[PDB]
Amino acid sequence: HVSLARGEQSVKRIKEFDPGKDSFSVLLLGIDQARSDANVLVTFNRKEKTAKMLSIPRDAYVNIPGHGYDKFTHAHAYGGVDLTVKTVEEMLDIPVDYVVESNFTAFEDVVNELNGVKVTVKSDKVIQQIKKDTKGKVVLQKGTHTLDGEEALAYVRTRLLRGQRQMEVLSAIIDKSKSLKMNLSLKDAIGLFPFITSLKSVESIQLTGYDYEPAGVYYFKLNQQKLQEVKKELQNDLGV
Numbered sequence: 001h002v003s004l005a006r007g008e009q010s011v012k013r014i015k016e017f018d019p020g021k022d023s024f025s026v027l028l029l030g031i032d033q034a035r036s037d038a039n040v041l042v043t044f045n046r047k048e049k050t051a052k053m054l055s056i057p058r059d060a061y062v063n064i065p066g067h068g069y070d071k072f073t074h075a076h077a078y079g080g081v082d083l084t085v086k087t088v089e090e091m092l093d094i095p096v097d098y099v100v101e102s103n104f105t106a107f108e109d110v111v112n113e114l115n116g117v118k119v120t121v122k123s124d125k126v127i128q129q130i131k132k133d134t135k136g137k138v139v140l141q142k143g144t145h146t147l148d149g150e151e152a153l154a155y156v157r158t159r160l161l162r163g164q165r166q167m168e169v170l171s172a173i174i175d176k177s178k179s180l181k182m183n184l185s186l187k188d189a190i191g192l193f194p195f196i197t198s199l200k201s202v203e204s205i206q207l208t209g210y211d212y213e214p215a216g217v218y219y220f221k222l223n224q225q226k227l228q229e230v231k232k233e234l235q236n237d238l239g240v
């Protein structure tokens with residue numbers, strides 16, 4: 001339970017935030033300070049009981065406050081969770097109400113504590129790449145299977161985009177739970193659990209763009225029309 005250096009609520013909110021009655025957002029960060037390799041923002045519409053997930057491309061070309069335009073992934077490296085949150089709020093012009101940061105070990109242990117998570121594997125290409133990645137320690141099979149933590153970790157690490165695999169497994173973890181550092185108390189986290197596990201819909205949205213490589217460093221330049229569309233959708237979802 002770590003607090004952000006920004007106050008009791010997101011500076012982006014114009015009105016007082018009521019955690020238990022308002023729509024809210026959660027930023028999930030996965031780490032191997034370090035760069036963030038999983039960057040998933042989830043917005044929860046309370047009245048509609050819906051969630052929308054968005055993966056921010058790790059190489060997305062964005063302004064990092066205090067550091068200029070750079071890969072999104074570097075925000076956490078330069079200034080930890082606080083700077084990553086600032087970077088997201090500026091990029092999407094929405095509040096990031098909660099943030100959750102997890103490393104490999106926490107992820108694997110969570111999956112194992114849940115007795116694995118269900119994934120429907122569909123690609124021989126992905127299976128072969130994971131075999132290579134893991135020197136054959138992880139051998140997935142096509143079809144619907146329950147993956148242990150080692151297997152799930154390999155699946156979300158291999159480089160369907162990686163961001164999409166991350167969102168897939170994140171939603172699977174939630175489904176299995178029906179059956180690490182953050183900025184809200186465990187009591188509040190647990191208070192949100194019934195809502196989070198009784199959603200009427202779960203959707204994903206995607207930031208599109210193109211490879212931008214001005215001088216031997218790869219960035220992903222965001223399509224600005226799609227970015228504006230995404231911003232409006234998330235702002236509407238949060239009721240801001």
Ligand SMILES: CC(C)=CCC/C(C)=C/CC/C(C)=C/CC/C(C)=C\CC/C(C)=C\CC/C(C)=C\CC/C(C)=C\CC/C(C)=C\COP(=O)(O)OP(=O)(O)O
Pocket residue numbers: 026028029030031032037038040042051100102103104105106107110156157159162166167169170171172173174177189190192193196202
């Ligand atoms: C699905 C949905 C609607 C909501 C789920 C998220 C929400 C809202 C949670 C609400 C708050 C709450 C109660 C949380 C309780 C905890 C809980 C149930 C889940 C916590 C989430 C969790 C365990 C992890 C979140 C992050 C995720 C999805 C995956 C972590 C992956 C990870 C640790 C690391 C990934 C690192 C990756 C992908 C690559 C690094 O590999 P590399 O550097 O060798 O290779 P490269 O550099 O060449 O690429």
